[PDB]
Amino acid sequence: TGLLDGKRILVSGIITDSSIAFHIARVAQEQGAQLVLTGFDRLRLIQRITDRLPAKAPLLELDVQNEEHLASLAGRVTEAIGAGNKLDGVVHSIGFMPQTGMGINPFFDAPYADVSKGIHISAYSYASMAKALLPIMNPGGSIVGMDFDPSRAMPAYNWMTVAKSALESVNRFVAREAGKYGVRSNLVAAGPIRTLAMSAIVGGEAGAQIQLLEEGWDQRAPIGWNMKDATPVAKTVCALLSDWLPATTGDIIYADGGAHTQLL
Ligand SMILES: [C][C]S(=O)(=O)N1[N][C]C2=[C][C]=C(OC3=C(/[C]=N/[O])[C]=C(C(F)(F)F)[C]=[C]3)[C]=C2[B]1([O])[O]
């Protein structure tokens, strides 16, 4: 018997096999969840990444900036899940920020056009997705998004930090809307993870300062932190997807090795 036995969950944000969403999807399927996966612009290549998952899963096209995609998403999911069946979970693992708003680039030199695009994708889309999917969610359901603790400023992450701050605020309002359906809405604030996205930033002064953040994180974390292992994060997301945190919503769960509770 698995944690998510007989639950229908939509997982978005799977770009590579190193994406956090892939490990969330992997662990979810290991725990008995029936999945619906979304992607964009490389569905042939994405499906082949998806094929490495334990179980087969339908793949739907979703650009969270496309209003037509969002307006038809709910229906397209139903034609895949089956009529009379609803979703029990939605995982939002989508974030983006142009180079000008991250890395070694001066914080002031990021034009708003780039920042607005990042915030649309990283923060506003969380509400867009909730708006589209809540009608086809069962009571007791769970919406989960991804987060990186933005309560304090930091190097390199720059404007992505701001987009995460907005996301945290958006989540609290999504929770108000989700409550009417009996649905919870939460974020998982993870410690630093070596996704291909972040791995690129490290290589592409800033990269050294990222290493300083990574090193300091593991030391600070009372139980340690492995940036190469996304599994503890994925299990945390699955925990929120289950029925074992049923009184938690509009909230943030920190899967960071306990680093945010330690100063030094
Ligand atoms: C899920 C996709 S996402 O786009 O929306 N996203 N959300 C959560 C999230 C959580 C942790 C992350 O890892 C880091 C690292 C990693 N170092 O190895 C370094 C820094 C810093 F501050 F040093 F630059 C920040 C986050 C990345 C992401 B994220 O921005 O990819």
Author numbering: 5 to 208, 213 to 272
Question: Can you provide the manuscript's text about this entry?
Answer:
The frontline antitubercular drug isoniazid (INH) targets the mycobacterial enoyl-ACP reductase, InhA. Inhibition of InhA by INH–NAD results in impaired synthesis of mycolic acids. Here, we report the identification of the diazaborines as a new class of direct InhA inhibitors.
To further understand the inhibition mechanism of AN12855, a co-crystal structure of InhA-AN12855 was obtained in the absence of NAD+ to 2.65 Å. Unlike the initial oxaborole hits, this structure revealed a novel binding mode that involved no cofactor and no covalent bonding interaction. (i) AN12855 forms a binary complex with InhA and occupies both the cofactor and the substrate sites. (ii) The diazaborine head adopts the negatively charged tetrahedral form interacting with the catalytic residues Tyr158 and Lys165 through hydrogen bonds and charge–charge interactions. (iii) Similar to AN3438, the oxime group of AN12855 forms a hydrogen bond with Glu219 and stabilizes the salt bridge interactions between Arg195 and Glu219. The large increase in IC90 values observed with mutations at Arg195 and Glu219 are consistent with disruptions in the formation of hydrogen bonds between AN12855 and InhA. (iv) The CF3-substituted aryloxy group fully occupies the deep substrate site tightly packing with hydrophobic residues Tyr158, Ile215, Leu218, Ala157, Met119, and Phe149. Resistance to AN12855 in strains with InhAI215S is consistent with disruptions in this substrate-binding site. The Kd of AN12855 for InhA was 77 nM in both the presence and absence of NAD+. In conclusion, both the ITC and crystal structure of diazaborine AN12855 revealed a novel inhibition mechanism that is independent of the cofactor NAD+.
